[PDB]
Amino acid sequence: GPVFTKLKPWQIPKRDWFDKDFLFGASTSAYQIEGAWNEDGKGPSTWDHFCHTYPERISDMTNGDVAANSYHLYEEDVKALKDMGMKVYRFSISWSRILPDGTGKVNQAGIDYYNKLINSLIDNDIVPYVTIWHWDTPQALEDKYGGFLNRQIVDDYKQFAEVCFKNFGDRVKNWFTFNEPHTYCCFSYGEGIHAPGRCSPGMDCAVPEGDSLREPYTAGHHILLAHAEAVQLFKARYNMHGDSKIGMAFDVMGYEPYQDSFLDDQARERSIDYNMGWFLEPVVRGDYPFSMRSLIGDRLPMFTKEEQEKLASSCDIMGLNYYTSRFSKHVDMSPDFTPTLNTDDAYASSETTGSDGNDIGPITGTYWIYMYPKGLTDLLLIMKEKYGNPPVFITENGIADVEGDESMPDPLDDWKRLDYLQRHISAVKDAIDQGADVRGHFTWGLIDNFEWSLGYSSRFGLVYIDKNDGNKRKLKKSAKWFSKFNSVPKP
Amino acid sequence: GPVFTKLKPWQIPKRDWFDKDFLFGASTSAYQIEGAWNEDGKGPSTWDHFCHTYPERISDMTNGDVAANSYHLYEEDVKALKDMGMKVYRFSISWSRILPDGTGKVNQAGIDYYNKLINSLIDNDIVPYVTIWHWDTPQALEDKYGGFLNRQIVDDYKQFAEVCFKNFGDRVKNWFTFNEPHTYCCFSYGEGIHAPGRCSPGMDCAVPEGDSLREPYTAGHHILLAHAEAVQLFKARYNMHGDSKIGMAFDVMGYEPYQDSFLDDQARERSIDYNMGWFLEPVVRGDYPFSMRSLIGDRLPMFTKEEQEKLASSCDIMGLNYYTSRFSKHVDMSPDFTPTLNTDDAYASSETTGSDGNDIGPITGTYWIYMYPKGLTDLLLIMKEKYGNPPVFITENGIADVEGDESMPDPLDDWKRLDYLQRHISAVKDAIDQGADVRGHFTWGLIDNFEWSLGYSSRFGLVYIDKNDGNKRKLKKSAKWFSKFNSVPKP
Amino acid sequence: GPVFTKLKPWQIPKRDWFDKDFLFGASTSAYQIEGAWNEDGKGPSTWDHFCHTYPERISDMTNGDVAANSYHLYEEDVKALKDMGMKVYRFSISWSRILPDGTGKVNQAGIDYYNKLINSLIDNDIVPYVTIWHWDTPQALEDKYGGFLNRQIVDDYKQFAEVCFKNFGDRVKNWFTFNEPHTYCCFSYGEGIHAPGRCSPGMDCAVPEGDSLREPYTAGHHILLAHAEAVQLFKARYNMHGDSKIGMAFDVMGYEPYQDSFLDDQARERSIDYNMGWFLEPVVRGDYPFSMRSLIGDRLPMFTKEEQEKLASSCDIMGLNYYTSRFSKHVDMSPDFTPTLNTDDAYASSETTGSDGNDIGPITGTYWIYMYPKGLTDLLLIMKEKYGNPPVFITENGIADVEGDESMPDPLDDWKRLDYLQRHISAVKDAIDQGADVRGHFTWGLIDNFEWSLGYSSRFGLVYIDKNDGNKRKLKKSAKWFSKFNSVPKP
Numbered sequence A, B, C: 001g002p003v004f005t006k007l008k009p010w011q012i013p014k015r016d017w018f019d020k021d022f023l024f025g026a027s028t029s030a031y032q033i034e035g036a037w038n039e040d041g042k043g044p045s046t047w048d049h050f051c052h053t054y055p056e057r058i059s060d061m062t063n064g065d066v067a068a069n070s071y072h073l074y075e076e077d078v079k080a081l082k083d084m085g086m087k088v089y090r091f092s093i094s095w096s097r098i099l100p101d102g103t104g105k106v107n108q109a110g111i112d113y114y115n116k117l118i119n120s121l122i123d124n125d126i127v128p129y130v131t132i133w134h135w136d137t138p139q140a141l142e143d144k145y146g147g148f149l150n151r152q153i154v155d156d157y158k159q160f161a162e163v164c165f166k167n168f169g170d171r172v173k174n175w176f177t178f179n180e181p182h183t184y185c186c187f188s189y190g191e192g193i194h195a196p197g198r199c200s201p202g203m204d205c206a207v208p209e210g211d212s213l214r215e216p217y218t219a220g221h222h223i224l225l226a227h228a229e230a231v232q233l234f235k236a237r238y239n240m241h242g243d244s245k246i247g248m249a250f251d252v253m254g255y256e257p258y259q260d261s262f263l264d265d266q267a268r269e270r271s272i273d274y275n276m277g278w279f280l281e282p283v284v285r286g287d288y289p290f291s292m293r294s295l296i297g298d299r300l301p302m303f304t305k306e307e308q309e310k311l312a313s314s315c316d317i318m319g320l321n322y323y324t325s326r327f328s329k330h331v332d333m334s335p336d337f338t339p340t341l342n343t344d345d346a347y348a349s350s351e352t353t354g355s356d357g358n359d360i361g362p363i364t365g366t367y368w369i370y371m372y373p374k375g376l377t378d379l380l381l382i383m384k385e386k387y388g389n390p391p392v393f394i395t396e397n398g399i400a401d402v403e404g405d406e407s408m409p410d411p412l413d414d415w416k417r418l419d420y421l422q423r424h425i426s427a428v429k430d431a432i433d434q435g436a437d438v439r440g441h442f443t444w445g446l447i448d449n450f451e452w453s454l455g456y457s458s459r460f461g462l463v464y465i466d467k468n469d470g471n472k473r474k475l476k477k478s479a480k481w482f483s484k485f486n487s488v489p490k491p
């Protein structure tokens, strides 16, 4: 136990299921892998500060001071990509490494680092896809005005994005402004389990001085305004050759109705609106979902007409970060129910078990990843049918192997990860067969890394990081399958 | 002009399109046909009072003092039904004729009248279906406590319903508690064009001392509570033989999205929720649609758990009163839009013309009846798929011939009405073929009658009332088609 | 007014909706743009003669003496194509410029002109598609034997086509023999509104000495025989490398049944047979539609077996010239109906309004272009399902901005044209998704031009021709959208 049935061998995807232009890759983020947290002039991020001031808020009491040491070891990351035959690497730029004070003087050592990584990727026939921000805010701006809670973040972000465009845009042609705004707003400002660790008085987070009903929406609104400003600038000044693309990457769960009835059908649409539509609908039509405005009202800021027009059609490419699905169970509006957390505003509870008593799918290791590839195909067809079928990349997809799971004693023997990934790659094929414009699949993660409030205890890598042997990269079974899948010539 | 294309002859329904148990009939209401407004002890209704105090609020300055004089001439109504071969007559009981003071002593002359009509119908092999209330509130209760705006209406209604059950239930086996609660709430308390004629200060109605954002919902809430009390009583004490049925009859428009986009898809669902779900969803699940609660909030009263349980599953039969359809056009929530009328709360405007510039269908006479039979089939399949496929009767369906329409110079030559009715009867067949549990079709109206704020200027009858020749009943072309359709033996 | 709803921004096509080989372009014709009508030895065409002898038959009393002056200004046409990022230009060769006397000595100045245009296109990475004849008959042949009414046109055309193949075929690899034979036969010989302007005695055209029941079919028969001879020659002598293609371009309207009944279903098939099948069915199977032979009989010439075999499978590529759709309304055969115009022979009237009284779609400017993109998808699926799914190019598609339309005061602000074109490009995507072999979309027109009997009063261009400023080319809003769509590098 617990029952883990693998695909039959004839059901395993082959590279030629996908056309020649389809892109397989892997993703990381700066705080999760780089280390060198204070090296060569780098200033502290909100994640540096959060870990150093509230260390107990990380599961295993670790932090990203060193992580996988990719600041020094990036050539081994490149080698792992090459060895697996990946065509794309999606990585993030550390704002605090580039602009130690958030604003002002650029750190040339930071510029030099990303240039080396970019040039090495290109030397090795791997295309760089760059996430500009991945939760990674300079603590200087957090101290100065409250970071994403203040409007000043909009212009400061724009100027940081411009440094990235100016320095890297001659070679980097594909950009994501923000990664997982919904996760970030919920966890950083609703539950407060993520940096800067804020929540309402009386709640259990590092800093219970916020407002779990308001601060998530304030932060999300500034993200969207920052995104709109950066894209306007990009399209006006940094796409002169017409061959660059900029978008946003969204965390998305699939949803099924908890019970077969029109009420859970309605709840399911509210859940998708809340999880996905919150940030996707603004970049599509220039406003939040109607459901959210009707339920959240004055706690959800209004866009001006100028802002609406700037936001509408502001993505060339959409990233979907998909792991799992939930059942959506209707909650009635009544005096017996009063929202206290931002997620309460959907009036739909996310359930791991459905009306018949069954889990949505098999657990994969970490508590929240239940396997349900159907959910991904469903979301991709929503993108197709509802939102105009924009170009979609799966920019994260994968599972954790968890320390203490006795069904996973050899960290290299990740047949469960491999099976999960094969099933989701097959689910992408299903969506493509049904007309969804899906352009690539990027596994999270390239290498085991710092899993936020769970530290190193959750390993998401295709490639093992041997923390006791100098952070050496070792290909897992899943990685070696990708070598075969991608027809990498053998030694 | 204007273009009115008729069905091809092979597309005209035949009686055998429907099974042997399907019921064809016609409908009327007490204020619209009875006259004798103050005869034999009858007390005044809100419609008596409205017309007598604000006569100018009726188009042609008429009222229902005499109407079709069916109080004296009901045998001619029965004869018209028989001559057309109708199997059902749906008529209403005048509360103020039965209980002149709303409460207290029953008027035996009122009882005697309905007994004669019921017995004549049964003598003539026509089944009576009885609407208990059709907008027809005793002015005594209006004066005493504000009628449907006060909770006292709930018990007073229950006691009136009980008088009807006690006196007529040995012979009448099919009941509708209320007719068109949505029309009544919108027009009587929102726009105020109908009795008692109330609306917000500054609006143009007889009594601008109300609140068009609140009074419609207060009135509708009491209707639902009154319905729940009457049905509980009926099922406990007046269905001992197990063969009686009680339900409610709803005015419903079909809706199509104004423009092909997910936003007007969403608007269309809000329009259906507002028009149909407002009263239907309470009698199905025991609460209002979620959409309405989310948009109306404190202006929409809450049900107690006891009330919810009483309301859920409180209809044996559903009546649908269908005339026409609209395009539903999304309205955004923003500072630029502030509801002032209850209908504003759907955030969906009802449009007669769609995105391509075309009317939804041909005009039929009166300004609001655009022909669109597709809309009826669509609503019937919603009943099937969403609300459990309860037994449905089309309890009103038809068109007006309007005074001054030069395309309708002979009031008996109603080929346009006939064509409309044939097309809607065919639309019911379509729904039945698709599995909808539709049990009958009742034309509105049996006879030309008092059309509320339009007076006698709109003629809806299968049977002409010759107002200059003693209110004589004369069969129109449509009526004579029903004689043929129903295989009535000829003289 | 009048209501013009635009696509939602997420519904606007993107270039990547189409595969890498799909071709976007624009079209013109020689008489409509070239001017220089008598320059460098060019002889007069039937259109020169028609305008110079019956000037009043042109709306605004203009002609194509100068047009857009593309004889001198073709480099600006090329520049406009390049600026929009178009990959194909479809233009026509003026027969009377190449062979001033129709037959005999070739005009080397004419040859030199087309060589310059071809070479400039190729220098600018634009592929030339060449229409050999576009209504453009030498008046010498018209005077000599009645042009397309005489069999001699067949060989004379063949010899002209051969001059084009010999001189241009080393570089031009894609050819259309004839453009819009159905429009030409109807308007030039039925109604007579187009050159040479012939119709039956008693009708209102310049020369009422013809026969509107016969001359259209005689002319069309010679077109088909000329096409068959030119293609036989081409395939035998001018496709030695195997990489050239030759076809024909057909004007086509979509049709819907006027009323839902089997009779208008039948009428709709006769309308499509008459409009499209007249010329398409011969090049597919080698005979006219059966419907036309059954109704037209002796007025429709027979093909010999040799001719049938030559015609069958004589197109490598099909062009569809699509603007609009109509309702098709059945006409009975009876003594009360006697054809007088060739179009009467379909026994199906083309109606702009349907049975419900609604226009088929919104008017776009000129009286005959009602927007109905569905109609194009429908026709493309007929090509797929009925006629073997040959390679199809949309070789014309667009709208006119009309002088005096107060809803179009700035001739550059053609958002209505842009919306129409986006919707039709989306309709082509729909057809492709459904398996139709559609290979390109060419907007009519590249530049505003001479719109036949309407003169310059109808502007169809992506690119404005400023007639008061030296015939300068100015990109309209639609043109600038194509620059973005095609990712043209910016200055």
Ligand SMILES: O=[N+]([O-])c1ccc(O)c([N+](=O)[O-])c1
Residues within 6 Å of the ligand: A180, A183, A251, A368, A451, A452, A453
């Ligand atoms: O719990 N989640 O749904 C969820 C989603 C994305 C995430 O990136 C994380 N996370 O990093 O802990 C958590």
Ligand SMILES: O=[N+]([O-])c1ccc(O)c([N+](=O)[O-])c1
Residues within 6 Å of the ligand: B180, B183, B251, B368, B451, B452, B453
């Ligand atoms: O305007 N309406 O939708 C509407 C509906 C039902 C009705 O009964 C009436 N009415 O009696 O005037 C009007």
Ligand SMILES: O=[N+]([O-])c1ccc(O)c([N+](=O)[O-])c1
Residues within 6 Å of the ligand: C180, C183, C251, C368, C451, C452, C453
């Ligand atoms: O009226 N038409 O259907 C129609 C079609 C194609 C055409 O090219 C023209 N035209 O040039 O006037 C007219």
Ligand SMILES: *[C@H]1O[C@H](CO)[C@@H](O)[C@H](O)[C@H]1F
Residues within 6 Å of the ligand: A029, A032, A179, A180, A321, A396, A444, A450, A451, A452, A460
């Ligand atoms: C997406 O999810 C993974 C797994 O939770 C995180 O580690 C990444 O930072 C986030 F982008």
Ligand SMILES: *[C@H]1O[C@H](CO)[C@@H](O)[C@H](O)[C@H]1F
Residues within 6 Å of the ligand: B029, B032, B179, B180, B321, B396, B444, B450, B451, B452, B460
């Ligand atoms: C349903 O509609 C008809 C026509 O508007 C009214 O006359 C009836 O009273 C109502 F029940």
Ligand SMILES: *[C@H]1O[C@H](CO)[C@@H](O)[C@H](O)[C@H]1F
Residues within 6 Å of the ligand: C029, C032, C179, C180, C321, C396, C444, C450, C451, C452, C460
């Ligand atoms: C196709 O139609 C356009 C618009 O009517 C004409 O100008 C062209 O000559 C014809 F090819």
